[PDB]
Amino acid sequence: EVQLVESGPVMRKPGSSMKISCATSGYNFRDFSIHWVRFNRRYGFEWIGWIKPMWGAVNYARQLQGRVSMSRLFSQDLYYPDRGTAYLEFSGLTSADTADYFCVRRGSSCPHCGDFHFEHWGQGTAVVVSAASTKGPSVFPLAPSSKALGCLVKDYFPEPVTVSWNSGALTSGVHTFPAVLQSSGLYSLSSVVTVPSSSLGTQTYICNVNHKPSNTKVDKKVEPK
Amino acid sequence: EIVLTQSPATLSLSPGERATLSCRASQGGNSLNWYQKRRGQTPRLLIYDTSRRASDIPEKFVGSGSGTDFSLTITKVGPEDFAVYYCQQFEFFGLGTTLEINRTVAAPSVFIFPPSDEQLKSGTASVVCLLNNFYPREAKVQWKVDNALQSGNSQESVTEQDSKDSTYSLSSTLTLSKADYEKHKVYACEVTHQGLSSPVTKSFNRGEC
Amino acid sequence: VWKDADTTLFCASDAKAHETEVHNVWATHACVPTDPNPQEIHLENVTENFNMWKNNMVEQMQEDVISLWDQSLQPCVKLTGGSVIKQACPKISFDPIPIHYCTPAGYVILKCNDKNFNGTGPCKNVSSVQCTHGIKPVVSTQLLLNGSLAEEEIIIRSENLTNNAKTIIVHLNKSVEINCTRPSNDIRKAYCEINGTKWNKVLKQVTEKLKEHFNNKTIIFQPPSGGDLEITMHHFNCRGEFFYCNTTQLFNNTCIGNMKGCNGTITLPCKIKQIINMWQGTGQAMYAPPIDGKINCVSNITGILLTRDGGANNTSNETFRPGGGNIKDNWRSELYKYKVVQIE
Ligand SMILES: *[C@@H]1O[C@H](CO)[C@@H](O)[C@H](O)[C@H]1NC(C)=O
Ligand SMILES: *[C@@H]1O[C@H](CO)[C@@H](O)[C@H](O)[C@H]1NC(C)=O
Ligand SMILES: *[C@@H]1O[C@H](CO)[C@@H](O)[C@H](O)[C@H]1NC(C)=O
Ligand SMILES: *[C@@H]1O[C@H](CO)[C@@H](O)[C@H](O)[C@H]1NC(C)=O
Ligand SMILES: *[C@@H]1O[C@H](CO)[C@@H](O)[C@H](O)[C@H]1NC(C)=O
Ligand SMILES: *[C@@H]1O[C@H](CO)[C@@H](O)[C@H](O)[C@H]1NC(C)=O
Ligand SMILES: *[C@@H]1O[C@H](CO)[C@@H](O)[C@H](O)[C@H]1NC(C)=O
Ligand SMILES: *[C@@H]1O[C@H](CO)[C@@H](O)[C@H](O)[C@H]1NC(C)=O
Ligand SMILES: *[C@@H]1O[C@H](CO)[C@@H](O)[C@H](O)[C@H]1NC(C)=O
Ligand SMILES: *[C@@H]1O[C@H](CO)[C@@H](O)[C@H](O)[C@H]1NC(C)=O
């Protein structure tokens, strides 16, 4: 099958630049144009441009002139040729350039169909741009009332944070909300779990907040009062 | 350039119903594409060139249309067919449409959580209010600090559709400084919703159990 | 009664057996001599649909010109993906000759005789012939050389104009010479003289003819956004040497008509390279140093290859940049009015 694989997650200060690759396989690199699409979070899609790897011919979106450049590179191996990576360079990053960036290719099927029928999408590359810096979260308890219980994950950067209870022993009734971007530039979310009111004095509940960018792991025990 | 309208945005589809959207493009004479995107995962093409299925796609996905308007159609909606759907014309793209599971009742339940003492030692207080379910999504969560209605100092966290029971959940967090928190006593959450005969209020007094 | 079909065509030319020249030698073994009495039968009351973008005639000519270039033009060194192929590289005689394409028995080529034919629509005046007209296999980028002119007015050719990924072919009804020269004394440094007064006069008309297809808005040219030198520059071959010319001056949109003082002769900075990227799609090829003496290739510019720079054009202007890249599109420039049909 035809696969498109992109480079890892990227965070950049505003004013910086980024170079995203996109490895290809399962087809002949020369015969197909590669387009770059960013899944604009709550803006839909904005098409960036294409590159025909024959001569590296490019066509950049008018609303991105002078900030984007594309290039290609063919396979080095003699035993595995016809593959190759495509590249995206983005300069002068600001706020609106925070999105999920994809490399696409038109599915090989028909002739008349125009060069915009993306059947193949890469796994994508999440790109965040702010003045904030990598920070590990604190873990405060949302203690159960004496009359549910949870943990709120506050002041961390960047995404993501994964949430599991008792090392993954209690999964039902667990509700880990999406992160919210505070005015401070740092993220926050909330994670709760409904449990019997009788097992609040016999059962121990623990929330395993994980944050890989900061290499942080906290073991928090939520209790009444 | 070309305008692409995907009205309306969302609708409730009972498992087995049929979908029908409208891609009333600005300038016709062209074709249209369709993508299924379960958020958190990559978009999957379904229909290309106005009306044609792509590789390895179940024949429940039906596309058609002509001129300016276009239509997609799903026969017997599956458990993994609930997601987002987008249409495209060349370099110009659409906005998207969301699918949702139906029924579901009408009533929200409300827990309240005071800020921990550990957090007060940092100088900030977070009052978190917890709602489960609650369809329709039209919420009116009002904060009240000593019967002073609060606004512009709280933020919300909503959708997380569970395939097991088709339920919702919602968080509205109130953020205050250590000073302002200790300045007042009663903290309430006013959840005014259509499926509520009367607005439900959960509260607590600062310093008590 | 006939049917649109595809078959193996055969080539015909006037190649000479005594010629040491590359194209003659290929055409000697690959072609038959030109028929001395070509006949054309005008079909009355008959319309027909053509499509130069789906034409198997194009893919055959492409397959031949590859063969021609693989048989004669052999680089000293050449990559085969991960390894090198070290062959023989003697200097050759190179000057492309007209090559007719012809149909076997049972088949006939249909020709579009409509003057303002753009390539995709239906025709009113259709005739039947056995062979195409004389077509030189001139490979090049940005500009089309030694080809055919438009019957009446400048004709814009494209598979889909609203599609930016579709290359545009400008068919000129009036050609302009481009005098390329490498003087005999830095031996890599050449130049191309072009009559400036006549170029921007033609390019004035090109601009105006293009404004019809884009809602009467302003039209501005820009240098290529990127790519290999072969596509960012006017790449071509004369006398076996690979030329690369900078065409920034050729699209001086400032000097188009207007402010009025831009006449005279314009010369383009050109260089002769020995390390090129093969249009074969086979990689990089190293050739021997140039030959002694004055190398001169006086060509005719008959067409331009543009790609519309397209995004979210909120502003009232379309940006066009030169560059073909697809050498199959060079053939469509000549084969646009021909179609192979099967008889009954
Ligand atoms: C114009 O583009 C559409 C795609 O939107 C394509 O289906 C159509 O064939 C193109 N028109 C022509 C005349 O080829
Ligand atoms: C060519 O003419 C046909 C028929 O009139 C028309 O449909 C098509 O749009 C034209 N193409 C161009 C590039 O003008
Ligand atoms: C008929 O064909 C001739 C020659 O092939 C051509 O010059 C002429 O324009 C055509 N007649 C009409 C009325 O189109
Ligand atoms: C160059 O153009 C002239 C007409 O301007 C023509 O007579 C001549 O044959 C052309 N040279 C070619 C096609 O090699
Ligand atoms: C070339 O065509 C244009 C229109 O496209 C016309 O104005 C001009 O007179 C033509 N040139 C000649 C020499 O006939
Ligand atoms: C082309 O230009 C060269 C000088 O660069 C000159 O010697 C030659 O006579 C010119 N040929 C024509 C046909 O103008
Ligand atoms: C350019 O061509 C024009 C004809 O269009 C001619 O009158 C003029 O003399 C030429 N210029 C030069 C410098 O030869
Ligand atoms: C061509 O020349 C222009 C201006 O002289 C220059 O900006 C451009 O970089 C050149 N293109 C090359 C060297 O490929
Ligand atoms: C464009 O034309 C003007 C007017 O003659 C000239 O000054 C300028 O150098 C030209 N631009 C080029 C050749 O890049
Ligand atoms: C164009 O044709 C002339 C002869 O008519 C020839 O000398 C010249 O080399 C040709 N141009 C190219 C690029 O081969």
| Separation between Cα atoms, residue A117 and residue A101, nearest integer Å | 17
| B30 and C CB contact within 8 Å | yes
Write out the E strands in chain A: 3-6, 10-12, 17-25, 34-40, 44-52, 57-60, 68-74, 84-91, 99-106, 118-121, 125-129, 138-142, 149-156, 174-176, 180-181, 187-193, 205-207, 210-211, 216-217, 220-222
| Separation between Cα atoms, residue C239 and residue C262, nearest integer Å | 32
Cis before A158? omega within 30: yes
Q: Is the CB of C237 under 6 A from ligand 7?
A: no
Nearest one of C173, C174, C192 to C182, comparing CA atoms? C192
Q: Which residues pair with B156 in a beta bridge?
A: B172
Kindly state the tokens that stand for A13.
């200060």
Cis before C290? omega within 30: no
Q: Which residues pair with A60 in a beta bridge?
A: A49
Partner-chain residue, chosen from A118, A148, A188, that has the shortest CB–CB distance to B111: A148
User: Hey, what's the torsion of the CAs at A153, A158, A162, A165, to 10 degrees?
Assistant: -20
Atom of ligand 9 nearest to the CA of C266: 13
Which residue carries 């940049």 as its tokens?
C321
Structural domains in chain C, sorted by start? 1-344 (2.170.40.20)
Centre of ligand 3 from the C-alpha of residue C39, in Å: 15
Q: Do the Cβ atoms of A107 and B48 come within 8 Å?
A: yes
CB atoms within 10 A of CB A174: 17
**H helix intervals, C176-275:** 196-211, 229-232
Question: Same fold for the domain at A1-131 and the one at A132-225?
Answer: yes
CB atoms within 10 A of CB A96: 10
Q: Which approach determined this entry?
A: X-ray
Kindly state the tokens that stand for C181.
């020269």
Q: Residues 20-59, chain B: which have Cβ within 8 Å of A?
A: 31, 33, 35, 42-45, 48-49, 52, 54-55
Centre of ligand 8 from the C-alpha of residue C96, in Å: 29
Q: Is the CB of C158 under 6 A from ligand 2?
A: yes
Structural domains in chain B, sorted by start? 1-103 (2.60.40.10), 104-206 (2.60.40.10)
Boundaries of every domain in chain A? 1-131, 132-225
With both helix axes pointing from N to C terminus, report the angle between C22-30 and C56-71 in degrees, rounded to the nearest 10: 120
| Separation between Cα atoms, residue A171 and residue A163, nearest integer Å | 10
Q: Which residues pair with A6 in a beta bridge?
A: A22
| Separation between Cα atoms, residue A134 and residue A214, nearest integer Å | 6
Closest chain B CA to residue A223 = B116
Rg for chain B, CA atoms, rounded: 23
Q: Is the CB of C86 under 6 A from ligand 5?
A: no
DSSP line for B154-195: EEEE-----TTT---EEEEEEEEEHHHHHH--EEEEEE--TT
Question: Domain A1-131 is classified in which CATH homologous superfamily?
Answer: Immunoglobulins (2.60.40.10)
| Separation between Cα atoms, residue C282 and residue C300, nearest integer Å | 29
Q: Is the CB of C119 under 6 A from ligand 1?
A: no
| Separation between Cα atoms, residue C127 and residue C271, nearest integer Å | 45
**Angstrom resolution of this structure:** 2.6
Which residue carries 């405060």 as its tokens?
A140
Domain A132-225 is of which CATH architecture?
Sandwich (2.60)
